[PDB]
Amino acid sequence: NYPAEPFRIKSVETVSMIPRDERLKKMQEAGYNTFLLNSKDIYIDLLTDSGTNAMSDKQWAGMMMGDEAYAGSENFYHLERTVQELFGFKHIVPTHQGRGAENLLSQLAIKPGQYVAGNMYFTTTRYHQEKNGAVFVDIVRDEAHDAGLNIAFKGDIDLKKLQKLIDEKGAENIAYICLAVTVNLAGGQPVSMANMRAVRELTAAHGIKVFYDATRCVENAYFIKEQEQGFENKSIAEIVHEMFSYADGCTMSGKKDCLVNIGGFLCMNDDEMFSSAKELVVVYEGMPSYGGLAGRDMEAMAIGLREAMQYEYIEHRVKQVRYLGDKLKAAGVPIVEPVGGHAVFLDARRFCEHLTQDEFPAQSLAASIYVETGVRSMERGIISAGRNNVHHRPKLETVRLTIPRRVYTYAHMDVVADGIIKLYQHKEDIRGLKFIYEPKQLRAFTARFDYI
Amino acid sequence: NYPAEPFRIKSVETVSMIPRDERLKKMQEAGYNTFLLNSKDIYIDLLTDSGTNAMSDKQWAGMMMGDEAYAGSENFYHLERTVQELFGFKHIVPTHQGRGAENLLSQLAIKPGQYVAGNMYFTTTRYHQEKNGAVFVDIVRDEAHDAGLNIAFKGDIDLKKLQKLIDEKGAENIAYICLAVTVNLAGGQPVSMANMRAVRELTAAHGIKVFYDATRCVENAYFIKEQEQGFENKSIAEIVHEMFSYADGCTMSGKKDCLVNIGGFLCMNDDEMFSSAKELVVVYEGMPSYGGLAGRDMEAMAIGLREAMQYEYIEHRVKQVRYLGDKLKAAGVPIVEPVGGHAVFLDARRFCEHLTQDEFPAQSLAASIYVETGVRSMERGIISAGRNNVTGEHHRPKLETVRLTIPRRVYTYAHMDVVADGIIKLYQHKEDIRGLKFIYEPKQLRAFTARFDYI
Amino acid sequence: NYPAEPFRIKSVETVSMIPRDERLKKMQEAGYNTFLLNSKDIYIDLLTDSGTNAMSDKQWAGMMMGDEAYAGSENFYHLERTVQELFGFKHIVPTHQGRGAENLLSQLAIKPGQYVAGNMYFTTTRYHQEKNGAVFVDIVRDEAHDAGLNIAFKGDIDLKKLQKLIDEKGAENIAYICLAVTVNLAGGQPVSMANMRAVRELTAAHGIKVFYDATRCVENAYFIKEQEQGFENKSIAEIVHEMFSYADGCTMSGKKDCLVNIGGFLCMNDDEMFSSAKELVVVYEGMPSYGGLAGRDMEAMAIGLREAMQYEYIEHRVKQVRYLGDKLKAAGVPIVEPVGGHAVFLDARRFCEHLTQDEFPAQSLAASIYVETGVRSMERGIISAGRNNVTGEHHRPKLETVRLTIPRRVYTYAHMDVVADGIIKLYQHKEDIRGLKFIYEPKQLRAFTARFDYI
Amino acid sequence: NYPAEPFRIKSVETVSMIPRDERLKKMQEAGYNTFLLNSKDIYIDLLTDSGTNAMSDKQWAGMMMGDEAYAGSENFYHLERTVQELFGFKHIVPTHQGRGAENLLSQLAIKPGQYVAGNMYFTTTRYHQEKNGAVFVDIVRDEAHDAGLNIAFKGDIDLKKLQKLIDEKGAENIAYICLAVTVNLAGGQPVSMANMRAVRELTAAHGIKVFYDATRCVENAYFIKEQEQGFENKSIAEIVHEMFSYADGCTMSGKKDCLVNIGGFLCMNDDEMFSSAKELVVVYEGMPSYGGLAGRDMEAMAIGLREAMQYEYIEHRVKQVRYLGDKLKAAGVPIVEPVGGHAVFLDARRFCEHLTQDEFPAQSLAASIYVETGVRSMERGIISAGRNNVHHRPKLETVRLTIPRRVYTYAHMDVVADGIIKLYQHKEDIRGLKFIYEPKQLRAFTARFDYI
Numbered sequence A, D: 001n002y003p004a005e006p007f008r009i010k011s012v013e014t015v016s017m018i019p020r021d022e023r024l025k026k027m028q029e030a031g032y033n034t035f036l037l038n039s040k041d042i043y044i045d046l047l048t049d050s051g052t053n054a055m056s057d058k059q060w061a062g063m064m065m066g067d068e069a070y071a072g073s074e075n076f077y078h079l080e081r082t083v084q085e086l087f088g089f090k091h092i093v094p095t096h097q098g099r100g101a102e103n104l105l106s107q108l109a110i111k112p113g114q115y116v117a118g119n120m121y122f123t124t125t126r127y128h129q130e131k132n133g134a135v136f137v138d139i140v141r142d143e144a145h146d147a148g149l150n151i152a153f154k155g156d157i158d159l160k161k162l163q164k165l166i167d168e169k170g171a172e173n174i175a176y177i178c179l180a181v182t183v184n185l186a187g188g189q190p191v192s193m194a195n196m197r198a199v200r201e202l203t204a205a206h207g208i209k210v211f212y213d214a215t216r217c218v219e220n221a222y223f224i225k226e227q228e229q230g231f232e233n234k235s236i237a238e239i240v241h242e243m244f245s246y247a248d249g250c251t252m253s254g255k256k257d258c259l260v261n262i263g264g265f266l267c268m269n270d271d272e273m274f275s276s277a278k279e280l281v282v283v284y285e286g287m288p289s290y291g292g293l294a295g296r297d298m299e300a301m302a303i304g305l306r307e308a309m310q311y312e313y314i315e316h317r318v319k320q321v322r323y324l325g326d327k328l329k330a331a332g333v334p335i336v337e338p339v340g341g342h343a344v345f346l347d348a349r350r351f352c353e354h355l356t357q358d359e360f361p362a363q364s365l366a367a368s369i370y371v372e373t374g375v376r377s378m379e380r381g382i383i384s385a386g387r388n389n390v391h392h393r394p395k396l397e398t399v400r401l402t403i404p405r406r407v408y409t410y411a412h413m414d415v416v417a418d419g420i421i422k423l424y425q426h427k428e429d430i431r432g433l434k435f436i437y438e439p440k441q442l443r444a445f446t447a448r449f450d451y452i
Numbered sequence B, C: 001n002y003p004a005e006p007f008r009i010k011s012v013e014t015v016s017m018i019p020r021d022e023r024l025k026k027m028q029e030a031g032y033n034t035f036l037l038n039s040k041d042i043y044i045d046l047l048t049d050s051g052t053n054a055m056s057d058k059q060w061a062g063m064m065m066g067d068e069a070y071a072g073s074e075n076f077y078h079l080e081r082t083v084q085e086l087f088g089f090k091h092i093v094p095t096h097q098g099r100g101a102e103n104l105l106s107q108l109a110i111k112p113g114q115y116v117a118g119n120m121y122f123t124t125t126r127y128h129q130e131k132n133g134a135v136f137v138d139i140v141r142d143e144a145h146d147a148g149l150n151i152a153f154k155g156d157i158d159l160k161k162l163q164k165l166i167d168e169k170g171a172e173n174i175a176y177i178c179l180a181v182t183v184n185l186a187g188g189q190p191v192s193m194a195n196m197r198a199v200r201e202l203t204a205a206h207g208i209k210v211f212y213d214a215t216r217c218v219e220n221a222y223f224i225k226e227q228e229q230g231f232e233n234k235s236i237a238e239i240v241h242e243m244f245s246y247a248d249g250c251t252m253s254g255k256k257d258c259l260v261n262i263g264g265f266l267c268m269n270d271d272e273m274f275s276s277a278k279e280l281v282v283v284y285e286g287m288p289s290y291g292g293l294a295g296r297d298m299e300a301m302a303i304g305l306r307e308a309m310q311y312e313y314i315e316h317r318v319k320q321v322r323y324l325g326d327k328l329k330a331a332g333v334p335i336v337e338p339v340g341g342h343a344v345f346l347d348a349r350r351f352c353e354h355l356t357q358d359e360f361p362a363q364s365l366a367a368s369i370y371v372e373t374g375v376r377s378m379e380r381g382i383i384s385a386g387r388n389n390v391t392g393e394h395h396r397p398k399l400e401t402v403r404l405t406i407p408r409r410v411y412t413y414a415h416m417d418v419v420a421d422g423i424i425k426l427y428q429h430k431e432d433i434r435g436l437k438f439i440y441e442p443k444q445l446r447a448f449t450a451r452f453d454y455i
């Protein structure tokens, strides 16, 4: 139900236990924005599960055996062999993180004017696709956009929508299908193996390429083992390996399910695309033999990816997130359902019914959570889409409580839960927010605000 | 009560997570003796809180700055300055752990034939005292021997017993008073500050030295802050500093409250004894500048001792143990009370009423606990008590216990639940636990290598 | 001259030490291409000084204090405060290495059709300039193209060429001047402070921006202190700070002079460009608070950049390279002169006079050097020059060289002797070195994966 | 001849480059004593090769995999297996360093009044023997006491002296033979395999036990491979294994040839003695399963001992010491000959001919070396023996330049050599020294002095 941590604590990280009065002053000095908070001031930093993971003793042992050679590093050979064994792809190009691989793939597989369709989008992924002249098309099923709808495998691609795109646009105008596992924006929702089969069957009949966003593929593999009939007696590794058998390649942000603080890579089976990838990695990331990573980090990511295949680790990872979601739902706090693999998303619509989507209820809710609890959370509603004078209104207005892997305990989840439950009582005190500075691209990171 | 961990996990330690049928295999290969289990086969190892603590990122940063010089290491000066500031003693000699310091103190402050009195005893501490020709006297309060009596500060010394010792035996025949904080043998019970001041006041009137067994002095200081009236406004470091102001020195096992995996030291104020300590440390430990420790470990112990002063850390340490004891007590599991600062003791005599002590209920209960949960605990009953080497019979202690010793900053409340739920489930059918018989029994220290089989 | 290492060895890196007959096996399996050799088969790897440096104990202590937070990491603030103090620039954006910063700068400061002029070029630097629609102009002094001309500060910009560029092409059509310190393509030649002041003086009169390629700016600063009169009383940090006072920003590869294995950053003073830099770093690198780097690596780079300011360290770094070049020159081995701050370049055209450039003497000499010593070097001749993709013929550079690139704080003078003695012995029978022919040749970047066999 | 370091530098240690004027002030603030110097003030610290070694990346990887369990640690199993494989002994008890094992052995194998004979002595070793009621008898050959005599294998035990002890005292009154490899006090001189054979043959015929001081046994093994006929085609490991086949047990200070900064152990083949050892290790060192060592240090010592078997490592180790000795001898500086495996010993008699052995020329020479060179050295002449009113005059009056393993370079040796050569020109400026404080035992460490 809620298993204990399948590991011991080897080393602890020093945190600051500042009281509520000083936390309020830290939030005021930050203009009531979580993205502008200082790490030294935050008790529980649930901003993102990206690169915030706690490594293992075996990974740190590999950190001591960094082969920092420019070419022919043993660390690269270990990572390349590991990814080939576990993902089954023919070739791998290391990158410094996921958006590095996305830059490479979007320049290699996109013709200007073609379409790229996927199960929702991500900020960096959609940018590099549109940067390279592609038009994004959301082919996730409509249910994935309903926060409260609790159905399994919400990340599945609607085959009818995919068939409609091929009929109206033609397979020649479709660069590739971008299948993300899991689907971050929908709440960390998984994709079923049956859906990955069906997408592969339909795309191959039209010669359409399929590239995965493998960023949280191990979490996705756990949901298959838990909820998809027929996979209950299959290991996580067997599920991961079969998942990528239905893809032509993948981009991976190791900073997620590879249990590292930096790292990523690009996979493909096509020899010619791999040749062009090595040409492009040099000018952006580095040599194909390190790709913008130190040897020690290629070693840590190779070891981390193998550690993620342990059933007990990934079961505890997901169920710890589920514990936080279950305790909030039991108290009546509105959340995105079902709980995803990496985060609990607070529904800012129902949390702030009095506020409209112009008043930015999610950002002021996240800013209110830290002031009252000392926990940082990420606004993942409207400001991620931005400001539009010619706003780019999304249906999901959420506040993301993102859990780094192997960093926090259930008692930490209780502090998060108990503090948010108390904020839910007087949810009317949450004010509105408006832009005062707007980046032309990816605005939620550097945007400043003021109360309405 | 029961606060969250006042820290994040920086790195983790890999464990095997073997199933029950496999754990039974391992326990049988271990001769049903948890001492013979392999670390790689254990999920939660509660054998001891000594040397098993998890260090901090700042401690591991110190591990990269080891000044490994044979003399004059910067790490020694950091350790020296820290102990001087926090404990207030004038001189410090490092040792590789606590019994190394006890070896030195017993040779320096004990004349053959003298007495050493203190609030009960520890095995290594008492050995070095008796090894140097001293007779041990237990001057602890009588309430300390009532394992079920739930009162505060059971480790306090009975001032009347000390006064009676000074009357019946000459004060010139008393080497020193060994005040231990906390008192391990009573279950980890603390000593009040008022008791330390009264012992210092009575001994100073007769010119009698007082040295502390301070291995768990930080745990002791938290009990003073929590339960002793008048210290609610004083920080842990202020309490620690005042504690040692009533002593002429101490022996310290850093492996306990200094949050390290190795290390100790010896403190004193007398300049002449410090000169003799430096001549003797070379014989057994090393130079006064490292004393049997790598430079990096003096640095880690210096950093860890300062981290122990954080109220939130030590409150969580003590209350995590208390959470385990409280959950067991609430389900009817018999435990030694009150819960100490570092371990929960199961009353195996009560737990296994259907077994006699000759059938080793504590050893069998520990074997059962591992099979059902993957938790290693330590037998602290008839097996550890040994045999009378003259008559051949068992040493039969009044306490037939299983010790759940909690390393610092290693486990979570979820791990405490694994220990509790498995023990509580075992207790709900405790009549099924079988007695053990000797299959192999060594000459000495039989707890470490003896092997058993079910009767 | 030739000072001892201003540091001790804290830890070592294991090497295989395979014999010659084994090394020949490895070289043949590598297709006689040192780029295809395995690191585990190499005793002394002089392929590059990028990312191959040995860190300090203090840097590794920082590696234990990584604040891995996605935004607001303490490691970023340490890096930011350090670069601001030592370089004097107003704003800093971290990147995972140097070409990441070059990607940002070229997109921020180049309008399609403009010119970018600088003292020669580097491959990645020039690519991002031309990728963003710029035309590169070489305004270096003519003496820089004379590989045997032994004069000081061969990297200085020809002020007349810059003045002529401002006259023939509009100043509004010049994106910026890319002043590199040092100049890699000339062999690692430094730029004088008087030249940087004259470039800043001339450009500021026309409102033209100046950005530095500062990857080896610390090596450059030592040459100023050693050879430029008037700086003999100024510290390295004072020289570094004055250098960047003549620039509006810089791109930095920490993998070079910041003594790290990964990392870089982008600096500028303009607030508006810094705002656009923060919007763009998210696209390719990461947040302005980590920019494609783990927290621990921002900490290591912050510590390493400050350590680079120590005069004794950088004097030994440059003079260790100079020792290799001096020993080779004293035996008659032909090298590019003067020796640069980071590498010694063998003149393979002169070394292998009996071979034509179509027989790849630099590639063959590097293959021979590894077989005889276990030293990997880099071909920097016709193979690395590539093919003309329109005509199919080789790119034929005037420099047919083998590069002995020295990582910082990794090797000793004894290792330099291994390189020198083996090369000197090869030179004493240089007529025995055989030419190479293509066995496998890829489409692009043939230096990395091509395979050869003896003719 | 002088091979390069068979390794690369992975990490460097920060040193202080204080000029001569400030070094002189640091020596004055220390009363012209090297033992009282601060590590932060010293450029090249040649005080001892004990625990000052630089570990490898593989050892530091093991430092990250410390199994800190009180019993059953994987690190103990690795160390126990490694010592059994490489030394061939049946049982091993870890100790925190060598004198910990010496305390154990002397209490287990010495009856009060018995004799312990060996090839010279060491400070801590002889103490524990005499502490337990044994009378030490030096059975090294006379040549070992002549500093300038350059003969091979000076550490060999004189079989005639050993035969004389058995004839005059009887084998029943001889506790054991203590065979040290190498012989520290003689200058690091090796012992030949033929001598270890002959000692074993003669002792076994009388039932006399033989226990080795294995502290610098790998250096000893190299000398056998280099200079003893028949062993030139035998590996270091084969030589080490055969060496201990002629012994009943050993005490080992891992802080020397095991390439660690802390650690040691006790070996024996006798089951009964091993049982008593486990009884005694508990009260002094700790459990037989860690013996006063953290798990990570048992791991590092196990890995270090295996690394010492590499011929290239140990060849460079000894020849680097030899390089320092050769450069000093070529300039006319008087030294102990031949150069030992771990240190170069400056003959203070010939370096200070004007001073007598009451004026303590070695201590003032060592104090003068640091003031002029910034290098710390250890007085290893008279003050190690002490002050006698009822001095304990030894024949060797030496200043030890002790080289830690894998820490320094040839350029460091040149700085040491060039500075001592200049001090040798005006060797008359070296004054005398007299005691002002005298420890009752092991005095040279805490003794203070003043000029005569």
Ligand SMILES: CSCC/C(=N\C=C1\C(COP(=O)(O)O)=CNC(C)=C1O)C(=O)O
Pocket (backbone or CB within 6 Å): A047, A048, A049, A050, A097, A098, A099, A100, A122, A123, A124, A125, A180, A184, A213, A215, A216, A253, A254, A255, A264
């Ligand atoms: C503040 S948003 C940027 C980092 C963030 N995810 C990063 C993702 C990337 C880019 O990966 P990198 O951050 O470049 O390693 C690609 N796909 C997917 C599904 C992701 O969730 C996250 O916090 O969720």
Ligand SMILES: CSCC/C(=N\C=C1\C(COP(=O)(O)O)=CNC(C)=C1O)C(=O)O
Pocket (backbone or CB within 6 Å): D047, D048, D049, D050, D097, D098, D099, D100, D122, D123, D124, D125, D180, D184, D213, D215, D216, D253, D254, D255, D264
């Ligand atoms: C300042 S003297 C003490 C440390 C020192 N040798 C230590 C030795 C020990 C004791 O070993 P520990 O120091 O206790 O690990 C035994 N035998 C032998 C032959 C040794 O050279 C040395 O510096 O040479």
Ligand SMILES: [K+]
Pocket (backbone or CB within 6 Å): B050, B051, B052, B261, B262, D067, D068, D069, D070, D293, D294, D295
């Ligand atoms: K330990």
Ligand SMILES: [K+]
Pocket (backbone or CB within 6 Å): B067, B068, B069, B070, B293, B294, B295, D050, D051, D052, D261, D262
């Ligand atoms: K040491």
Ligand SMILES: [K+]
Pocket (backbone or CB within 6 Å): A067, A068, A069, A070, A293, A294, A295, C050, C051, C052, C261, C262
């Ligand atoms: K690198």
Ligand SMILES: [K+]
Pocket (backbone or CB within 6 Å): A050, A051, A052, A261, A262, C067, C068, C069, C070, C293, C294, C295
């Ligand atoms: K990170």
